[PDB]
Design a binder for this molecule. Sequence first.
Ligand code: NA
Ligand code: NA
Ligand code: NA
Ligand code: NA
Ligand code: NA
Ligand code: NA
Ligand code: NA
Ligand code: NA
Ligand code: NA
Ligand code: NA
Ligand code: NA
Ligand code: NA
Lengths: 170, 169, 170, 170, 169, 170, 170, 170, 169, 169, 170, 170
Amino acid sequence: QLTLRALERGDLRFIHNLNNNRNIMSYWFEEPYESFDELEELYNKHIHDNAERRFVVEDAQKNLIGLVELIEINYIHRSAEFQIIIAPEHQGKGFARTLINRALDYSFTILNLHKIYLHVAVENPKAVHLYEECGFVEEGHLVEEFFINGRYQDVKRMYILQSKYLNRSE
Amino acid sequence: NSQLTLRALERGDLRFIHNLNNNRNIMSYWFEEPYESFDELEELYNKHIHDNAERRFVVEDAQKNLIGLVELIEINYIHRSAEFQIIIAPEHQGKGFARTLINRALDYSFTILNLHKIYLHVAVENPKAVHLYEECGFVEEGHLVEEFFINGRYQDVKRMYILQSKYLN
Amino acid sequence: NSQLTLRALERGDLRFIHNLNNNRNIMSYWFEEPYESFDELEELYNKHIHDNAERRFVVEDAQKNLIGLVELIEINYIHRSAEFQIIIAPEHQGKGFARTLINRALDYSFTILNLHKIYLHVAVENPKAVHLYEECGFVEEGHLVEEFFINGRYQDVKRMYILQSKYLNR
Amino acid sequence: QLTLRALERGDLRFIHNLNNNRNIMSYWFEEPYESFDELEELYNKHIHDNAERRFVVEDAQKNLIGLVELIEINYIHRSAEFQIIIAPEHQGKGFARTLINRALDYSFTILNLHKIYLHVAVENPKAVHLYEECGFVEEGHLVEEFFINGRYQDVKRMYILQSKYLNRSE
Amino acid sequence: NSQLTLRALERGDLRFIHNLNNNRNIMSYWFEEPYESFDELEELYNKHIHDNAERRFVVEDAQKNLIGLVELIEINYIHRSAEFQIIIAPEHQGKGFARTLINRALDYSFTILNLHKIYLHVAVENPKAVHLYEECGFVEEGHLVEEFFINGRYQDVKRMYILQSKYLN
Amino acid sequence: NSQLTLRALERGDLRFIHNLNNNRNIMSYWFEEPYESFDELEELYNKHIHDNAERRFVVEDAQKNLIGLVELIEINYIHRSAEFQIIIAPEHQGKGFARTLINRALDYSFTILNLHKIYLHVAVENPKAVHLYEECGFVEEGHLVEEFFINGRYQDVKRMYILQSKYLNR
Amino acid sequence: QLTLRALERGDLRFIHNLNNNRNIMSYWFEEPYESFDELEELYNKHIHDNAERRFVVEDAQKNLIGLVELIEINYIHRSAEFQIIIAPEHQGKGFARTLINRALDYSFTILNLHKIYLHVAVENPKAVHLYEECGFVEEGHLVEEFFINGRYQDVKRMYILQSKYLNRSE
Amino acid sequence: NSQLTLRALERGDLRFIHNLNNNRNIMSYWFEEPYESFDELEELYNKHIHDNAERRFVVEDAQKNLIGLVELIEINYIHRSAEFQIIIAPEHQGKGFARTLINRALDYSFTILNLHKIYLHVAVENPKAVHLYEECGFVEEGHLVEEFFINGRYQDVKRMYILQSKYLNR
Amino acid sequence: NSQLTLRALERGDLRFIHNLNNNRNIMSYWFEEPYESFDELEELYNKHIHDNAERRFVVEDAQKNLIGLVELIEINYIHRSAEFQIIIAPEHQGKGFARTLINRALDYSFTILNLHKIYLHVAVENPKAVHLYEECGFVEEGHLVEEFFINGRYQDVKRMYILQSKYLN
Amino acid sequence: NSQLTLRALERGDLRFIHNLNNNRNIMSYWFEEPYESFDELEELYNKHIHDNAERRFVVEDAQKNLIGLVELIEINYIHRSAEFQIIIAPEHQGKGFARTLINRALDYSFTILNLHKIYLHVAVENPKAVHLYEECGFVEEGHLVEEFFINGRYQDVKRMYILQSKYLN
Amino acid sequence: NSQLTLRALERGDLRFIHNLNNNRNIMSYWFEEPYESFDELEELYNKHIHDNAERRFVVEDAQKNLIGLVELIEINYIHRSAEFQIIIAPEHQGKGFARTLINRALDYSFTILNLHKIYLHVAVENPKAVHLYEECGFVEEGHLVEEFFINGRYQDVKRMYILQSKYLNR
Amino acid sequence: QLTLRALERGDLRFIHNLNNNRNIMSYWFEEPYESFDELEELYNKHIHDNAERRFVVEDAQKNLIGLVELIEINYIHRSAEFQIIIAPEHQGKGFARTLINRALDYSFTILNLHKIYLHVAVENPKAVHLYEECGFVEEGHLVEEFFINGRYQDVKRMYILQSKYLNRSE
Ligand code: NA
Ligand code: NA
Ligand code: NA
Ligand code: NA
Ligand code: NA
Ligand code: NA
Ligand code: NA
Ligand code: NA
Ligand code: NA
Ligand code: NA
Ligand code: NA
Ligand code: NA
């Protein structure tokens, strides 16, 4: 009952809301921003840039559930970095699995990428568990990689390959 | 069917065109630029409004219901050839419209645009469509191997064509 | 028939212009650029607003119904010539307005634009049009072979002219 | 009871109306135009160009009476060409004298021009009489100067100088 | 009078400014470009919005009635000087406002802009204004001969000035 | 006081920003360009929307009244420093919001922007402001002589700083 | 021994020389020009415009013999207007036939045009004879079509079709 | 004297043009923009390279000495008129070239540009110039009062014309 | 042959490329824009310098003699396919270079660009070339009917392809 | 002296103009923009090449030695006034040239430009120059108080003028 | 080895940069745009001259031979990290310069750029490179699976890091 | 015997050389740069920007001795920050006093600034002594203000006022 669709300009307020409660700077095409005004101008400036692709997941009643973002897309190595955010009022209702599958499905069956990877805070073992359930595997434990809430934190880098995803039931 | 009209695409038709996409498990293109959002489609529309490499038409019935899209792409004016595609919206498939749509497109291509050759691709795994095109005078000239990545695998397609001299005679 | 007035084309008349084309089996042109959509037409209009190689006028009745279009194209200010065409909306064909529009267009061309020669094309397989133009003082100067691809085949056209000296001495 | 004020964009429809019933091409900064659309674009394009200055004369109830135009303004020789047009519904109500004085007043007491000249058709002796009454004097009888209604016409060039205007009662 | 406020000119004030002109028999200027129409004024406004050679303020009363205009032009930031003019709208002349307006302008010039010298021109044929400026501490430093063409003849003007050290002490 | 929230400045807050200036006897600046009018401000805003040398935030209460402004300027990403200022609207002065805004601004600067040093200027002839900042952990590092021309005379200002290491170990 | 090649910028002096001794205005993409400077700027401005194509014919020793120009190229009706000029020192050496065949060959076997037409002065029966020998046929006798050396002259319009050219020996 | 040739002005002739001005006590103009320096002239040249309201030609002898300049300005393609001026370099005055240049300029104007009327200005206090023009078929149509400020005073000028019909029937 | 090197096209190579054209009786294209002159080619080169739809390489020997041109066009990075062409200059045809050139192109396409499929067109009336491509692992997937207007008639071409998995295994 | 010629400034003269500056203890301006370097001067020159608010001329002798600069600034074409300055290069001061230079400038201003009034500023602390201008028909119309910051203090200047009717009669 | 100097990259070093790539079986990038030709590289250089996300330096010897390249990319000024790579020209490999270049690059990164973390990628199937970096204080934090398509297959890479705190306390 | 002159583009190599041996990032109008190419582009971009002014001091033989830079120039508060650098081969030859006086002279007698201030490393007592001798006084001891050679360093801010400089001998 959830559907994935391309981000549109009318979704920017939702996006901006989602970044509001985060203890790290937000980027659009690697340019940092804080305001809705910046975001809108960056959106317009990068509208044809294929290095990042974003999608929103909506329910049957068109409530926005979450954001799926693919950034650092490289079309020789056929890799991209993935992040998802679910709106606070929809957390813990088991939608994160659905969003991850929809993003993997799109990445691997339409965009024809070879590898998707993500970062997750070491101090977030619940999210680690989710990504592992969905076929991600740790390939890195990056040390003091991001300054987050007043201190350099460690993150896990985790990946999945297209060949795994598409053939693992065959 | 005699009631179906073909007209040029206009900017107020892009919502329809964009909806025709979200059902397809292949990337969509406008003048060979990929796009996913309506916003992207609109900017691409504006950017290529004078470009004669591609031409698009929509078909409406009598009540101005949008029936489908006719698209000519890769238009070359020395060799006088174009690649043709048609999409019919969901709620109007299975109504015996396809033939009329194909006929209006061929008519325009050959009676107004003065093209020599029109070709199309159809999935090998789509035999009913092959049959249909065959009835409208298309003939296979190629079986393209692993040509397009569609829904998670590289798929073969038939390339079918028809010529102006055949259609007009 | 003296209730018909000729005015310069304006951007709000482009819908009417575009409608007049849908009834013709020949590619339409604006300043020699082909177009099919209203959107195209409107941008071409904007692009050529100051270009004096073509001039257009619409004819209206006392009640402001749009009757037809007069176009002067390939205007050359050394040789003082131009190609002329009229198009009457379907719903007003056969009402006896064509002779009036022709006279208005000639009057403008010869008394205000100070042109020396006006010519037109007419289909050879359109003899009653040939007859109308003769009655209005045009004379055949060419029979152009396979000149235009129209409705699936190359068609022959008569070129017909009239001069300023003849018109102004009627 | 008549007042002279600078032309504004909202007056362009009036201007365009005034040119409608004229048997000569109209110019804005020496560019010919027929449509309202052209006029508006030319207006915007030349908004800072000091080679021409235009003014509208309005009554007490803000009805537009006429147009005063100064063109070919040259600030070394301090000369300009003047034309006035009165709207057909206000002709023959003795406003032409008032418009001419207002334009001369502005030309000579604010713009500090040295010479104003105008052209008038030889075949318009009524207008010749008006300008003579207002202190203009013939300096030229220009032969076949303009093509007007199907034939080259003669015009009088007539002038007045600032020193005449400002000191003739002293 | 203590109720009169000075604020920066804004785009919605240009109608007022333009009206203040049509009564004057001299050409009006914006950043030394002459203008006659409102349309010209608006484009000039937009074109020079960042230019610090000239600064303008309007004075309003308590009910936001527009009282007049204060204009500093020829602003030079090495020599720290500017030429000052004030115009009071018709329906508010003869109300004992001029002094307050001049005082607000001098205050701004000397307490915020940190100018050293402010000068103005007044027509010789306008003695009552000379007297007024004199009361506000201005002194004649020149009698400019045939300086401006105004209403059909070249007219003389007085140039009057006041310094920051005098005003602030 | 925990009902106050800090958000990024947006174009719809510029009226409030502009209002805050009319109460100050010092020239105002936006990215080091001086401005006096709202029109100026709005163009400067647009011009500098992507410039990361200055960042601004507005504080609102639970009922969305605009309480004040936090500005970080001269931001340098090598030396990791910035100059900080707050301004509280007149109608909310003295209500005990200043300490809260300061803490929010410091928290942002030190936990999200990862700055090393924040400094400010305060008037020497403003001792109770000096006292507020001391209470919030700032220490004097300069007494700048005749630094700014304010209200008719050059005034002295204290420069006061705080470091990231001190703040994060409170 | 003659070869046809695309016009290049270094050939412009030759082109300009060729127009020098002609009693009609010269055009580049329907813009008139007299100077070498104009020509060069027009060349650069229209470098990607497919409405006209020009070629120079050179001998074995790279002497420029003549110019072949195709203008008014239309890619729906697949027609173009052709002109050739031979440099005065190479006239009457039987090169005109060769240039005409090379242009027809290119038009019909590479550009895939359907129709080529040209104008020739009625008062130039020698050139009429040449074009007739090379398969052109009169389709029009255009009356007072061009002002040439102080008077309106008549011209023959003459054409050849691709199907004639390609199949006439079959 | 038939060794003199008329060619279009080119950018390498601007030094000569500029030199011709230093000998005149009147402001010089290029497309109605006044100029004093060579630098100005060169930019004005570039700016107006495609503008057809003025055309210029230089006359050279068989040995390529620059003899003089022919200028056609205020060219109007409806009324088919232009203002003509010649200037002969000081060192070639009195040699009998002026009549030849005049004839060349008239021939061009009337046989290639297809103009209807050419006019010129000559100083009233320059009677031998008046005499030259009369001999070349010009006739006075105006005596313009205080038309141009020249060398410290406003001077009167004769306007003198010739028509195409008269010239071509000589 | 082991001495032949493939490098990226550069602007000083456009003279060579242009010369390779004047012998061919088909229109030449750069990013699907037709061109005839060197001047046009140079402006097209500059205009598309960042466009990744087409990639070109020249092959030189040891003495930096230009041997030929390798061109990948219609490059699509979702389907991972490109159309390939090679031209060998006159004075170097018939020297047993073609195979090496084709091998360097396939190598680059499949080992660096990570394309999945490479296809080419060859004239049906050119059997010796078909044979050659066949030896390098290409296989016919289409016989395109009256596809291109070449030297005065519409000609048929074979479409041949090879896949990355085949080449690399 | 009869040998001295006035011509319009050209771009190759900017080196001379820039050298005339480095001796003066006041900021230099071009169209009221301050400048210090040659590079700045050259860009300002190019930017204002069409601006008729200021006009400049250089005077050369017979051997094309540059003698000095004549500058008209603040040119107003309604009031027909301009501010005039002249600088004579070091190695040519004290040669009885100044008068001729002033005469050529006045001649141009009044016989060609058709200005009504020319004015200049001279330092009060420069009496010999005042005398000179007086001999050329200039008269004091103002004593401007603390007008310019020059070499570390605000200095007074005389404003002197001459009219067209006087010069030409 | 202390005769080696590190300087900023300049446009005259791009030939050397380009030469270093021809020896690598991986697509090259400039500010994440892939390039193959020198022409491309030179335009990308120009385009990104002010972009601070990447910085490059070339190492030369006392005789000015170009030894190698140090590149810092993905530079982030909040988290204070960057990815580092060196490349030594073929002819200078094995000479013992790599350790020196590494130390120079680290010194710059940590003492002038004030970065917190430097990381690099090295091929897993390049163990002696792994050994060099370990000796220079780098430690493995990831083994990235099938990260880059190199020479016909997806290869694994080690990610290796070093911190500012460790380096500056050596 | 030393002279101060405005910086010119031909001096940029000298400037770049001077920054070479410095353990802090270099800025031009607050934009950081390392390469000569960046510097040149920044120079051109800011050529009319009055926020910074630079001067070079040359001897009698035109050897460049040093750079004087005024940055953060503010024309309301009439203050600027000053730095000087002397080329290594000219250090310790007593030129620093001369450069400081020339800069103060220019600042105070031509630019009409009110205040000049500078920063000097606390760990550079020799330079502190020099500036004190030349009338500068400490107004601040800024704590951990700049990251310089691997650690946050303290600097003295020191100032002098125009009124002191100009009147202290009176
Ligand atoms: Na994108
Ligand atoms: Na199109
Ligand atoms: Na037009
Ligand atoms: Na105007
Ligand atoms: Na301003
Ligand atoms: Na910012
Ligand atoms: Na072309
Ligand atoms: Na022209
Ligand atoms: Na490319
Ligand atoms: Na000027
Ligand atoms: Na960079
Ligand atoms: Na500067």
